[PDB]
Structure formats: structure tokens, C-alpha cells
Structure 1
Amino acid sequence: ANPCCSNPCQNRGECMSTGFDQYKCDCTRTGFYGENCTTPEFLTRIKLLLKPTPNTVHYILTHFKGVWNIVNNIPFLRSLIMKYVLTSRSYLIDSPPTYNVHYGYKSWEAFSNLSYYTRALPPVADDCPTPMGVKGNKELPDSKEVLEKVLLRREFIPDPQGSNMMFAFFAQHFTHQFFKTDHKRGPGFTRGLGHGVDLNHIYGETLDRQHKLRLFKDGKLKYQVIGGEVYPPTVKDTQVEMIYPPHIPENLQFAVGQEVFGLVPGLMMYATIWLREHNRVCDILKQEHPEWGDEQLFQTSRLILIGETIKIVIEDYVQHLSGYHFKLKFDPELLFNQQFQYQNRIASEFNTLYHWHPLLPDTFNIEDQEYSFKQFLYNNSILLEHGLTQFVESFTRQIAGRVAGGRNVPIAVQAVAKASIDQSREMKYQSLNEYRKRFSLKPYTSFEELTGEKEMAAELKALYSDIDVMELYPALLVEKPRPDAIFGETMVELGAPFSLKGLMGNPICSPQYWKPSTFGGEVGFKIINTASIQSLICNNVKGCPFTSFNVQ
């Protein structure tokens, strides 16, 4: 019934009803005018001509390795390029944030209520005739059918980019600080009220939890020593709430910042590494500042680890994922003469797209062992069994699954994939093609264009009938990958903006924060500016084993 149900307004124009069956588009600052904001302004037409497609740019970034080799070595050139990747991306994100699952129009409630995930696109109104607005049938295709026909893995498909298990578990661990759905409220709600990289997954969401985790000497976090090795403390010792099945012995109930991290030994591996890093940085700071107390050692270390985290995410993690020959750089100063909002709100869609479960192998291979999901889940004995060094060595060698390209979701986790589909609908997501437009990409004109093949395309076509009715989440996992890449166009073009915004939007990246004194001086500052996934493991894992995010 809502006359905006067809999503009439193009180019980021906003639709507003002007009567029971009339609408109007607000084209303010879109660069277009006309009833649906589809008539371009002169200068807009120019820009459109001189604008290369994302696939073109991606090609240039992943080719001409010889040129990039030169560029990467000319500091002012590298800075110029990175500044452009930062700025071009962030303009795609609304900041201050706008919509959420309950508000398809701006409101103080949607702005002020931090318990919601924000929305890059507003929900389809409740009184629209179809799930996607006006197109398609009264009901989307059976989600089980979609799951089984195009999502579920038959044979394991490895990632051509060589992503390993160190990568997979880093992705899970890192993102699960800001992807923390409040299932008590619903899929559109979050428990991560910092809406970003605050390391609550190490330190805790709340002050009370943090204090239980802290030693209150030398700024350190509590820990225990088992077989000469440092591990997180127990629930019994700390009284912090953790999720564990009832059969887990108390001496194996490790207590960490994120209550869910005991559920996978790969998570507990990173939990342990970072715990160690924190206490390590505490020793460094105490040496520089024998005058400092516990609070200041703890707080400064946390700030340093936030910096290390962002550093590693950009220059190692995203570097690997991108396949760019251009060398990405973590440098807050690049934005100082630029318009940029030092804030962020986690988007529901960012969460949805990040369900990268195809990464998971059929078994987890540590040393001589090959563990099944059943044996791997909630099983910290495995970690104690082999130890950190062996986890790193093994996980660095084991290849992860390809994410886009279709049919690679492990059966063990099929319920999670079905829930991603069902909850997207529950949250009234607009279609894949609406999202594509929202991020300046060309709508797909057929299912075959989407997948780049014929078989899955045909199954999808029989299910959905209309490409404009296809759903974002299934599309992401079925999309034609970039050549020999882990992802297709839509994953990168939505993901990159959300990501860089949450990284650079952090307050430590602001001018008043980004200076040596913030981090206890030049020594603390250097820890951030030289951080890497390798140094993180070298300093904190016995034997300083070699590591990487790609299979060697």
C-alpha cells in the first residue's frame, strides 16, 4: 500500500509518501533531478564518463605488478593512492547513521538507540505486497531449497587465493567483537555498543566484566600457567560468565572477553595470543614508566592493542584478501586534511555479508590429527594437547574454503546458513540488485550473469523467476568470483566501505589521539606502527614459528 514500496527513487534519492497513493523523491545532493532522481546534472554526466567500473579498478590493482613495485617504494605516491582508497570508499557510508530494522525513515530513535545494527538500505515496509516491495511472488522461495541447491558443499572447494586457517579464525575472532547479535531482542539488535574495534572481545563489554578479567597489578590481565604455558584464567577463578556446554570441566572453562570464544579452539587460540600481547605490552610500558600505576598501564596497553589490531587488519588481513599488488597502509594522517567522520555504527548488512562459513574445512587438521566438527567444537583439550606453537604451524598450512562461487557451505553448519537467509527476510532486506545500486554497481540482468555459469543459475532462476527478486546473502555465496579470487564484486564493494569506515573511524585515528603521548610515548607508538600478524605470533608463541594468512 505504501507508494514507496517499489523503491522508485534512484541514485540515493529518498522516497516519501505524499498521500495514500502518491510519492515524492528528494534528490537533494544526489547529482540528479526528475521525478525519480534519474536525470543527471551536467557535471554529473562528466563524472559518470570518467568513472571506471569497480572491475576495471580491481584489474589494475591486481595487475602491473612491476609498476606497483615502483609505486609501493615512493612514499608520497603510496600515500596518495591509499588516501584515495580510503576516501572513495567512506563516501558510500551514511555517517551519522540513519535507518534500522524498525525505521525506514530517519528518526531520533534510529539515530540514538545504540542497541540496533544500522541499515545501509531501509527495510521494505510491512504493508508492501511482496517481500521485496512490489516484485516477485507473495513469498520468497523455500530457504531450505535455496540452501540445498546452491549453498551446500558437495566437494570441498579450496580458496584459490590460498587463505589458510590462521586467516579463517582471525576473521571470526576479530569480527566477533562487533558482530554480537542480541538474540533476546532479534536479528536487528547488537550487544556490541562500541560499534567497532574496541577489543571488548579481550577486555569485556562492561566495566564489571573487565575488572573480573584484570589482575590489578602492572596493568595486566589475569592468566594461568599450564605446562609452562600462559593461558586465560578459568571461570571458577574469575566468575566471568562464559558459554560452555554442561559437560565441560571447570578447569577447562577458560574465561575471556567474549563469552562465546570457548566454543572453538581456533578462537581460544587467538584469545590466548592477544592476552599474551597485552601483558607483554604492559611489561614494555612499565619499563618506560616505572612511575605509572596499574590503571594507566592497563588503559594505555588497551589503546596500543587497538592500534596493532587496525594495523594488522589493513596491512596483513585486508592486504591478503584484496590480492592487490599495491601495498595498503595504516596511516591516520592521510585523512587529516580530508573530510571524514570519526565515528561508526555497525551495519546489519555488514554482519550478513560476513557470514563466511564456506571458509571452514571438512576437518580441522592439527599435527597428525584430523578433527571433525563434533570433536573440534567446545574442545579446549585439543588446544592444551598440541599447544599454541603447533596450532599456528598447522593452521598456517591448512587451506580454507572459497567463499563466493557457490556450493561450499559445510553441511555441519547448514542451520547457520539457513538462518542467515531466514533472518535477512525477517529483517525485510531489499533485493541484491537494490543493494548493488546502493553501492554504485550495475544491477545483474540474469542469474547467469550473477554466477558466471549455467547450472546454479538455472536452479536459482526456477526458484526466484526474476533476477530483481534475488536475495543479497545467497547471491554473495553464489556470485562469480573475481579471477582466482575468494570473493565476487558485490562482497568487496559493500564490504570494503563498511570495513574501512569502522577501522579509520576509531577515535585513536583522530588527530587529538594519533600522537605518541596517547600510547605512552614513541616506544608505545612504535608497537602500533610496526605491528604485523607475524610479529604478533613471534613475540607471543613459543619458538616464534613462521605464520601468514596464506598457505605457503
Structure 2
Amino acid sequence: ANPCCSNPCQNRGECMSTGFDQYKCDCTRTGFYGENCTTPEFLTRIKLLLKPTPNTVHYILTHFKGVWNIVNNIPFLRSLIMKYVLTSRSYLIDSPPTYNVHYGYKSWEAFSNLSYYTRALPPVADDCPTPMGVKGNKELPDSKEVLEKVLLRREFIPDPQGSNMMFAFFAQHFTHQFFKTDHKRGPGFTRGLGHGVDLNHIYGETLDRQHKLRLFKDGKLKYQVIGGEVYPPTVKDTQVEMIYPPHIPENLQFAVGQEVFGLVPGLMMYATIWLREHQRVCDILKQEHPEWGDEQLFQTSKLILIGETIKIVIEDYVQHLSGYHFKLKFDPELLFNQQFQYQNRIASEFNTLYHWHPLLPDTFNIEDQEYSFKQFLYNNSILLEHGLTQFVESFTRQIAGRVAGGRNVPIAVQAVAKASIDQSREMKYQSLNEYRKRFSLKPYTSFEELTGEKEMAAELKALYSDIDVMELYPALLVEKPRPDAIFGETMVELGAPFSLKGLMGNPICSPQYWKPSTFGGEVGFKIINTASIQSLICNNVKGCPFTSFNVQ
């Protein structure tokens, strides 16, 4: 019934049910007017008729090495550039957050209840004619008819950017502090209440849990020595609850912080990395402040690490996943003179679209041995046996799958990829084009437009019929990759904005926190600003292995 079913209002205008059969578009603060918020004000016209495509943008940004070389040299230019990528990229986020799974209208419950995931686009009214609003059939294609037909891998497709397993597992561990779906409540419900890079994954989801992992000495995190290496405390020792198969030796049962992380040795490898990083900081802090107490050292360290994390995640991770030329820069002071909300609330889309299982290899090959999913998952001795350095090295040299090519999901994790499809449907998501429009992209004219090939296109077209009924999730993995990109424009466009407001819109990035001392000193401050995944490992791993987020 709901007259706004049909998503009438374009250009961002909010739609409203003015009488069962009627609706009105709140074109307020859009650049357009007229019943559907579509006809522009001259200024708009001028902007529009002078705006370059994310691709025409991407081209420049990925070409002209030498020039970008010159820019990367000129500091008073790199910053100008960085400042801009930052500023514009995030105008697309509604922070303060609007909407969630149960609120299609602004609502204070949608604003207060931190247990939800914000949502870039309001769900589809439960009283609509079709699940995509008005277009489509009484039902949508079947999940497996998309999962198998268009999503499951045949031959392992390698990423054309050389994303290794170091990167792959990092993107998993990292995003896993904010992504934490509270399934007991349902999809759309999170447990990463601190909506953002709160390093909760290392430090326990609470205070109570955070305490059960702390040594309460020199600001240190509890650890344990196995043969000669520091490994996380045991659930048996520090009663911090974990998730482990009812047979794991109880000596495997590592503690780490984020309760799921024990289900994959890659994760557990990274926690052991950071666990060690904390202490390492703690000591530095401890000899810069011989008079600090445990609680201070601890509280200052978590700040520093977070500081480091935002650096690596921009200077290395985004830098790699971008494949630019221009050198991205983690510099909070760049946003200081601009309007910015040092506030964030993670959406469900960001979660969904971040399901990068296509990154996953068919064998977890730790040099001089390859393991099956069945063997790698929930394994104690794998990590303990091989060693950290022999993980760092294996992973530096191991191509991970390309993401948005088509049909590259590990037949194992096909179940997950399944859920994703039929779960995002449960959460009543919107059509792939409404999202494209929403993120200032132009909707696709054909499944063929979406894919850049004919085979799948026709397979999907067969199923979905209308392009305007294609889903955000599938369309993302079976999307035409920009050049030798790991994924296409649609992925890259919805996610860039979301991934920067969670990094930058973080208290430490605030002008009130961004100063030495907040980090114990000038010292601590100059740890954040010298961070790199390269150092993270050379500082914490038995050798000082070379590493990267690229396959050498």
C-alpha cells in the first residue's frame, strides 16, 4: 500500500505518505526540486555539468606515475590532495545516523538504540507489492540460483592486484571489531556497540572482559610463553569466554579479545601480533613515565595502538586496495578547518558489502605445506607449530582471490555467501540501482552493464529479469572490475565513504585529542605517525620478515 513503496523521490528527497494513496518528496537541502526532487537549480546544473565520473577520477588517480611522484614529493600538495579525497568522499554519510532495519522514518529509536546497524538506505516497507518495492515478482530469484549460477568459484581466480594472505587476514581481523552481528537478536543487530575502530577485538568487548585479559602490571595485556614466544592467555587461565569446538585441547583456547577470532588461525595470528604490540608500547611508555601506574600505561597504550591502526589502515591497507600512485596520508589536522563529525555509526551495508570471502584461497598454504579449510579452521598446532614468522612469510607470498569478477566464492564458504544473499533480503534491502543512485553513481541499463561479459549477464538476466531488481550483494561480486581492480565501481563507491568516516570520525582524530601527551608524550604520538604493517611485524615477529599487503 505505502505510496513510498515505489521510491518516487529522487536526488535524496525523503518520501512521505500523505494519505494512503499519496506521497510528497522532501527535496529540502537537495540540489533539485519538483515533485520527485529531479529538476535542478542552476548552481546544480553547473556542478553536474562539470563533475567527473568516479572512473574518469580513477583513471587520473591510477595513471601518470611521474606526476604523482612529483605530488608525493611536494608536501604542501600531497596534503591538499589528501584533504580533498577525505572531505568529498564522505559527504555521502548521514551522521548523525538515520534509519536501521525497523525504521524507514527518521525516529528517535533509530537514533538512540545503539544495538542496531545504521543503514544508508531505508528498508522496503513491509506492505509493498514486491520485495524490491514495486518492481519484480512476488518473490525474487532463488539464492542458490545466484549463489551457484553466478557466485560459486570453479577455478581459483587470483586478484589482479596481488593482495596476499597478510592483507586478506588483516581485512578480516580489522573489520571484525566493528562487524560483529548479534545474530541472537538478528541481522541488523550488532555487538560492536562502539560503532568504530575501538580496538575492542584486542581488548575485550567490555570492561569486565577487558579486565580478565589484563595483567594489571606495567599496563600490560596478559600473555603466555610457549617455547619462547608470547601467545595469548588461555581461556582456562583467564576466564574470558571464547568460542571453540568441544574437543579443542583447552590449551588451544587462546583468549585474545574478540570471541570469534579463535575459529581461524589467521585471525589468531594477528591477535598474537597486536597482543605483543601493546606490551611493546607499554614498556616504551613505562620508561618515558617510570612513575605511571598500570591503569595509565594501559589506557595510554590502547590509544597509541588505535593511532597506529588508523595509520596502517590508510597508509598501507587503503593505499594498497586503492592502487593509486598518489600517497594517501593519515593526518587528522587536515580536517581541522573543515566541517566534520568526529562521530560514527556502522551501517548494515558496510557489513554486507564487506563480505570479501572471494579473497579466500582453496588452500591455506603455509610454505612447505597446504591446509584444507577443514584443517585450517579452529587449529591449535598449526600456528604454534609453524611459528609467526612462518606465517608472515607464507602470507606475504600467496595470491588471494579477485573479489568482484564473478563466481569466485570458495565452495566451502558458499554457505556464508548464501546467507549474505538471503539475509540481506530478510533485512529488506533495496535494488542495486537505488544504491548506485544513492551513492551518486548511474544505475545500470543491463545485467550486461553490470557484468561486462555476456554469459553471467544472461544467466542473471534470466533470473532477475529486470536490471532494476538486481541485488546490492551479488551484483557486487559479479560486477565488472574497474581495469585490474580487485572489485568494481559499485563496491568501491558505497564503501570508500563508509570506510573513511569510521577512521577519521574517531575521537583521537579529533582536534581535542590529536596532540602529543594524549598518547603519553611526543614519543607515543610519534609511534602512530611512523606506523606501518611492515614495522608492526618487524617489531613483533621473531625474525623481522619483510611483509606487505601485496604478493611481492
TM-score bucket of the superposed structures, by smaller chain: over 0.9
Counterpart Cα distance in 2 of 1:385 and 1:544: 18
Counterpart Cα distance in 1 of 2:493 and 2:261: 29
Counterpart Cα distance in 2 of 1:476 and 1:374: 27
Counterpart Cα distance in 2 of 1:28 and 1:205: 40
The aligned counterpart of 2:226 is 226
What is the CA-CA distance between 1:160 and the residue it aligns to? 0.6
1:15 counterpart SS class:
strand
Q: Deviations over 1:29-74 (max 9, x none)?
A: 1011000001100100000011001010001100011100000111
* Runs (4+) off by over 2 Å: none
What is the CA-CA distance between 1:543 and the residue it aligns to? 1.1
What is the CA-CA distance between 1:144 and the residue it aligns to? 1.1
Q: Deviations over 1:505-550 (max 9, x none)?
A: 0000000100001001111000000000000000000110000000
Q: Structure 1: 5+ residue runs without aligned partners?
A: none
1:361 counterpart SS class:
coil
Counterpart Cα distance in 2 of 1:256 and 1:309: 17
What is the CA-CA distance between 1:485 and the residue it aligns to? 0.9
What is the CA-CA distance between 1:367 and the residue it aligns to? 2.0
**Matched length:** 552
The aligned counterpart of 1:41 is 41
What is the CA-CA distance between 1:259 and the residue it aligns to? 0.3
The aligned counterpart of 1:350 is 350
Counterpart Cα distance in 1 of 2:343 and 2:139: 38
Q: Deviations over 1:312-349 (max 9, x none)?
A: 00000000000000000000000000000000000000
Counterpart Cα distance in 2 of 1:303 and 1:51: 39
TM-score by length of 2: 1.00
The aligned counterpart of 1:263 is 263
Counterpart Cα distance in 1 of 2:279 and 2:154: 44
The aligned counterpart of 2:82 is 82
What is the CA-CA distance between 1:437 and the residue it aligns to? 0.3
What is the CA-CA distance between 1:237 and the residue it aligns to? 0.4
What is the CA-CA distance between 1:175 and the residue it aligns to? 0.3
What is the CA-CA distance between 1:76 and the residue it aligns to? 1.0
Q: Deviations over 1:68-124 (max 9, x none)?
A: 000011111000001000010110000100000000000000000000000000000
The aligned counterpart of 1:383 is 383
Q: Deviations over 1:160-184 (max 9, x none)?
A: 1000000000000000000000010
2:262 counterpart SS class:
coil
What is the CA-CA distance between 1:411 and the residue it aligns to? 0.2
Counterpart Cα distance in 1 of 2:344 and 2:457: 37
2:513 counterpart SS class:
coil
The aligned counterpart of 2:203 is 203
Q: Deviations over 1:454-501 (max 9, x none)?
A: 000000000000000000000000000011110100011011000000
Counterpart Cα distance in 2 of 1:353 and 1:510: 28
Identity %: 100
Root-mean-square deviation (CA, aligned residues, Å) is 0.4
TM-score by length of 1: 1.00
2:55 counterpart SS class:
helix
Counterpart Cα distance in 1 of 2:20 and 2:365: 61
1:282 counterpart SS class:
helix
Counterpart Cα distance in 1 of 2:74 and 2:431: 43
Q: Structure 2: 5+ residue runs without aligned partners?
A: none
2:178 counterpart SS class:
coil
1:262 counterpart SS class:
helix
The aligned counterpart of 1:418 is 418
What is the CA-CA distance between 1:203 and the residue it aligns to? 0.3
Q: Deviations over 1:115-134 (max 9, x none)?
A: 00000000000000000000
Counterpart Cα distance in 2 of 1:83 and 1:258: 33
The aligned counterpart of 2:183 is 183
The aligned counterpart of 2:32 is 32
Q: Deviations over 1:267-288 (max 9, x none)?
A: 0000000000000000000010
The aligned counterpart of 2:441 is 441
The aligned counterpart of 1:290 is 290
What is the CA-CA distance between 1:380 and the residue it aligns to? 2.1
Counterpart Cα distance in 2 of 1:10 and 1:465: 23
The aligned counterpart of 2:492 is 492
Counterpart Cα distance in 2 of 1:47 and 1:133: 31
Q: Deviations over 1:433-454 (max 9, x none)?
A: 0000000000000001100000
Q: Deviations over 1:173-227 (max 9, x none)?
A: 0000000000100101000000000000000111010000000000000100001
Counterpart Cα distance in 1 of 2:14 and 2:438: 12
1:256 counterpart SS class:
coil
